[PDB]
Each structure stands twice: as structure tokens, then as C-alpha cells.
């Protein structure tokens, strides 16, 4: 069987070559546990790569590409064999083939190679795969190729360390168009790609925004499929980690009402968590952006999550409320208190995550400052917010933080107690 197949691929008879290659492909295409190792050891990889260059024989190119694709679907060591035999530049050249089946297969093969690791991704990019890949995406491209190409594109953008932004940037205009697909697989992969490109310094974010994607990304927050929502949400989140003007591009398209709906629908915890995280980077902004959060009606639901949600969600909500107390106006802070934020901030003063304890203490100190200002302006007897913290059992928790191993926490607690309770 295998000896006959090897003989077929190593013959110079067109039909034996095709027959034997096709047999190898079927072998590598079985339901599970394809014998990739055994095919590699048989020594046929170099011949398959030679077959890639037979432009007189598209069917053979296709079968060989399919087989090479499935070998590169295996382990890194499997993939290395394909690389060592020079397949990458040849696949890149096949992106220009007149055969649609061959082109699509080449796109898939390069996706598998780039998916192996950041080094393999970078090798594919360095062999000039990106432009040819984009080159044959147009108004007439069929769905199968659109899906394959979008998936491969996301592989070209994926991974840490991240690919050079100059090498992935040409992808942005195509991705900006692809997120307008209604196909869920295209949307999924295009959004993941944008999630990778938007994760980093603010210049990257700026390039993403300039590609025009904000309006559509926001629409996608309302997509019924979590497979689309998740990466769309991640990309929106990434964008609002940028500066105030960058963050404003998201707010301007009614993102905040969409985000609120993610908090109040019955959605996965991971989704609510990232919605909160996105919101916290908005409340990390200016007073107008904090006001936009308030106006959308987010605070009530957010406070409720801070009080009652799973811990991963509470952590993000804590940052969101605390950021707002830090950047917000006197009057804005008073509104957060009226929505009931004091008690759940106090409850978290005993949580095991010291970063969260610190965030909540900071929030409470900002609230206390507002309460003290209110007292002073009227020449009143009491800081009303200090009494509310006492009633919420926050004061005793802050007292006990004087015993904390962490200096930051310790110094802050003492400072807070000395300023507001003597």
C-alpha cells in the first residue's frame, strides 16, 4: 500500500502521481489521528512541494497543496518539515494561480503555517504573503475564499510577541470591509484580527480608528452570536484603552447604551466582565465621558454587579466605579453615592486581591473628600459620607487594614483615618 503510493509519487507518470498523491491526501484527511508522522517518514514531502510548481497540472497542485496543508496542521515538528522543503515561497506564488481551488488551498496552507508560532507567522509575512493574499479579495470573491482568507489574515495578526505593525497594517482596509459581512465565520475572524491589531500602543489604536471601523464594531456589540460579540467587544475594549479623543470615537456611536444591554441581558460571565472592563476604561476618561456613562443609565446596574456578581465581574466593576470617583466631578461623585456605591466598595475591602482592595480604598477616599467638602461649604457638623461608610461597616474594615502586610494599603488606611476620623 504505502510502498505502492511512494512508488506512484516518485514516478514520472502523470496519472500515477495524481493517484498516489490523492491517496496520501485521503490518508491525511481521515476523521482523526491522521498518520502525519508516517507520511513524513515515507519521504514524499519534497515531491509534494515539487508538485506545487506543476502549473500544467492544477489537479495535482491542488491534491499536493491539500496534503501539505494537512501535514502543516500537525505539530511544530511536522510543520518544520514543510518549511524546510521550501513550501512557503511556493505557496505565496500560488496565491497568483489561475486555479481558484489552488489559490484557496494555498491560503489555507499559509494559515496553518502562520498559526504554528510567532516565528512561523513572521516567516510567512517575510516571504511576502500579505499583499498577494489581499490582492485577490474583491467584490466577486466567493464565501469559501472569504472565510479562508479572513481566518488566515487573523493568523497573520495573532500571537505574542506581536507581528510588526508595519507588516500587518495593509490588512486594515480589508478587515474594515470584512466586518460588514453578514457571515458569522467572516465576522468572527475579522473581529479577532482587529482585536489583535488594536491591542497595544495608541498609535496602533489610531490606525484602527482611521480605518473607519468604530461604527460597525459598535453595531456588532449587539450581535446575537457570542462568537461574534466576544471579539467585537474585545476590540471596542482595546480601543477605549487609548486617549480621550480615541475613546470618544467609540462613545460617539452610542456604545454606552449597547454596553449597558450587555450588563442587563442574561449573558456569559466572561462577556459581562469584558463589558465592565470596557466601561472602566471609559470612566478612566474625562468628566464629559464619565457624564456619558451616567446619562446612559449604567451606574445603577454597575453598582448592582459590584455588589452581587461573580468575583471576576466585581473586580472590573470596582475599577469602573473607582475610576469615575477619581476623574469625576464633585456632583458626579455625589450621584454615584446616591446610586448606592458606598456599601459594595466597602464589602470588597476584605477581598483577597490587594489590587482590588487598593482600588476600592481609593474610591472611598475620593468619596470622603466630596463628603468633607460638602461639610465645609455649609460649615456643617458631620461628613455625611463618613457616616455612610460607618453604617456600611466600611470604617471597621479600614481600621483593620492598619494591620495589612502591604505598605500602600497601610499608609492609605492610616491617612484616611487620620483625615476623616479624629
Amino acid at each position: 500500500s504505502l510502498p505502492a503510493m511512494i512508488g506512484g509519487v516518485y514516478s514520472d507518470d502523470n496519472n500515477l502521481q495524481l493517484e498516489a498523491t490523492t491517496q496520501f491526501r485521503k490518508l491525511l484527511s481521515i476523521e482523526r489521528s491522521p498518520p502525519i508522522e508516517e507520511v513524513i517518514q515515507s519521504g514524499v514531502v519534497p515531491r509534494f512541494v515539487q508538485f506545487l510548481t506543476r502549473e500544467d497540472f492544477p489537479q495535482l497542485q491542488f491534491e499536493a497543496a491539500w496534503a501539505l496543508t494537512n501535514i502543516a496542521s500537525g505539530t511544530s515538528e511536522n510543520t518544520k518539515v514543510v518549511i524546510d522543503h521550501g513550501a512557503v515561497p511556493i505557496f505565496v506564488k500560488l496565491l497568483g494561480s489561475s486555479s481558484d481551488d489552488v489559490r484557496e488551498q494555498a491560503v489555507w496552507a499559509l494559515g496553518n503555517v502562520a498559526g504554528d508560532s510567532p516565528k512561523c507567522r513572521d516567516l510567512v509575512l517575510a516571504n511576502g504573503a500579505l499583499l498577494p493574499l489581499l490582492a485577490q479579495l474583491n467584490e466577486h470573491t466567493k464565501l469559501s475564499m472569504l472565510r479562508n482568507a479572513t481566518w488566515t489574515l487573523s493568523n497573520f495578526c495573532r500571537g505574542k510577541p506581536q507581528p510588526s505593525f508595519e507588516q500587518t497594517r495593509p490588512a486594515l482596509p480589508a478587515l474594515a470591509r470584512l466586518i460588514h459581512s453578514n457571515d458569522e465565520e467572516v465576522l468572527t475572524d475579522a473581529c479577532w484580527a482587529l482585536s489583535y491589531l488594536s491591542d497595544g500602543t495608541n498609535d496602533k489604536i489610531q490606525a484602527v480608528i482611521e480605518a473607519g471601523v468604530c461604527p460597525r464594531l459598535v453595531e456588532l456589540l449587539l450581535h446575537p452570536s457570542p462568537s461574534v460579540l466576544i471579539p467585537a467587544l474585545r476590540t471596542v475594549g482595546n480601543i477605549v484603552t487609548g486617549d480621550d479623543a480615541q475613546t470618544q470615537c467609540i462613545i460617539d456611536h452610542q456604545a454606552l447604551p449597547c454596553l449597558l444591554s450587555l450588563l442587563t441581558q442574561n449573558l456569559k460571565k466572561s462577556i459581562k466582565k469584558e463589558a465592565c472592563w470596557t466601561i472602566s476604561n471609559i470612566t478612566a476618561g474625562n468628566k464629559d465621558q464619565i457624564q456619558a456613562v451616567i446619562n446612559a443609565g449604567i451606574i445603577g446596574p454597575l453598582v448592582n454587579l459590584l455588589q452581587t456578581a461573580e468575583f471576576d465581574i466585581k473586580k472590573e466593576a470596582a475599577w469602573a466605579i473607582s475610576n469615575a470617583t477619581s476623574g469625576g466631578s464633585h456632583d458626579q461623585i455625589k450621584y454615584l453615592v446616591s446610586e448606592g456605591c458606598i456599601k459594595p466598595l466597602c464589602d470588597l475591602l476584605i477581598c483577597p486581591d490587594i489590587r482590588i482592595v487598593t482600588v476600592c480604598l481609593e474610591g472611598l477616599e475620593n468619596i470622603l473628600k466630596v463628603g468633607e467638602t460638602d461639610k465645609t461649604l455649609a460649615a456643617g457638623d458631620v461628613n455625611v459620607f463618613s457616616q455612610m461608610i460607618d453604617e456600611a461597616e466600611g470604617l471597621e474594615k479600614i481600621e483593620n487594614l492598619q494591620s495589612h502586610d502591604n505598605n500602600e494599603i497601610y499608609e492609605k488606611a492610616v491617612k484616611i483615618l487620620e483625615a476623616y476620623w479624629m
Binding site: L28, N70, A72, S73, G111, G115, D116, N155, W192, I230
Partner: peptide
């Protein structure tokens, strides 16, 4: 639930 890094063609 990230997209696969590699895909084997079975069909």
C-alpha cells in the same frame, strides 16, 4: 473559545 490556530481539511 478563541479561533483555532490550525485547521485540517477533511472534506
Amino acid at each position: 473559545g478563541s479561533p483555532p490556530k490550525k485547521k485540517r481539511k477533511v472534506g
